[PDB]
Amino acid sequence: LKQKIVIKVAMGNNCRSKAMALVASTGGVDSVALVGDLRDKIEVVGYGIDPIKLISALRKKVGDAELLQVEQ
Amino acid sequence: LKQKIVIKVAMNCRSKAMALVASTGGVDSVALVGDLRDKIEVVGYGIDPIKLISALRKKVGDAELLQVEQAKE
Amino acid sequence: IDLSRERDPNFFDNPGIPVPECFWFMFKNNVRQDDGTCYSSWKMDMKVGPNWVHIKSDDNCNLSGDFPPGWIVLGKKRPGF
């Protein structure tokens, strides 16, 4: 049931604020954390998160977004 | 340079509160913590806890600072 | 109060900063109010009932603070720390 998802997003000013708000407010999300030296990957932990819709939203609203990891 | 802040928030209000805290300049992470998911733990740089509490009360509802701790790096 | 006998605090370790070594447990009249994590050999500010209390940690996660009447915050090391 418990999921860890890592997405690389293209983030240009207030892009972190905008991407973090979107992921943070996605259904099933418990935690969001910027990782990597450039803080350009988002680690998402929760239950029942739909990774396909998360990637759609991020691509529509923020920029290029690649699924790097899905773990359960 | 980093600090950890824990906030009790009466809290979809969880999604609203998380979106507000996560949007703050200098945020590294935000997490719903506690068994009731009734607390937000924020880590980052140049986060003013007073300003964050004011934003939460005006947007989401009752909110109280619980813990403020510098990162031991 | 036996801390060896308390459910583990629900936690999230930010991946960008070191992992805090201690669990802490806050009680009003021996009744658990709140819990979380903190660093060893370090310091934090905590809202303890009506008052902000400066709490100091030693290397063993023992917590000293001037707690208001009826309140205490007690620390211990997390598994394998």
Numbering used by the authors:
A (entry chain A): 187 to 197, 199 to 259
B (entry chain B): 187 to 197, 201 to 262
C (entry chain C): 33 to 113
What does the paper say about this structure?
The Asp67 and Lys78 polymorphisms that distinguish AVR-PikC and AVR-PikF from AVR-PikE and AVR-PikA, respectively, are located at interface 2. The crystal structure of the OsHIPP19-HMA/AVR-PikF complex revealed additional hydrogen bond interactions at interface 3 relative to integrated HMAs in the complex with AVR-Pik variants. The corresponding residue in all described Pik-1 HMA domains is serine, and while the hydroxyl group of the serine side chain only forms an intramolecular hydrogen bond within the HMA domain, the bulkier OsHIPP19Glu72 side chain extends across the interface and forms a direct hydrogen bond with the effector. By contrast, PikpSNK-EKE-HMA bound to both AVR-PikC and AVR-PikF with higher apparent affinity (larger %Rmax) than PikpNK-KE-HMA. By determining the crystal structures of the Pikp-HMASNK-EKE/AVR-PikC and Pikp-HMASNK-EKE/AVR-PikF complexes, we confirmed the formation of new contacts across the HMA/effector interface that likely account for the expanded recognition profile to AVR-PikC and AVR-PikF. Crystals were obtained in several conditions in the Morpheus screen (Molecular Dimensions), and X-ray diffraction data were collected at the Diamond Light Source (Oxford, UK) to a resolution of 2.15 Å (Pikp-HMANK-KE/AVR-PikC), 2.05 Å (Pikp-HMASNK-EKE/AVR-PikC), and 2.2 Å (Pikp-HMASNK-EKE/AVR-PikF). Interface analysis performed with qtPISA identified 15 hydrogen bonds and nine salt bridges between Pikp-HMASNK-EKE and AVR-PikC, and 16 hydrogen bonds and 11 salt bridges between Pikp-HMASNK-EKE and AVR-PikF, compared to the 12 hydrogen bonds and eight salt bridges mediating the interaction between Pikp-HMANK- KE and AVR-PikC. Inspection of the structures revealed that the side chain of Glu258 does indeed extend across the interface, forming direct hydrogen bonds with the backbone of the effectors. This single mutation also supports additional hydrogen bonds at the interface between AVR-PikC (or AVR-PikF) and residues comprising β4 of the HMA domain.
The rice NLR receptor Pik-1 binds the Magnaporthe oryzae effector AVR-Pik through an integrated heavy metal-associated (HMA) domain. The sensor NLR Pik-1 contains an integrated HMA domain between the CC and NB-ARC domains. Direct binding of AVR-Pik to the HMA domain is required to activate Pik-mediated immunity. However, the stealthy alleles AVR-PikC and AVR-PikF avoid interaction with Pik-HMA and evade host defenses.
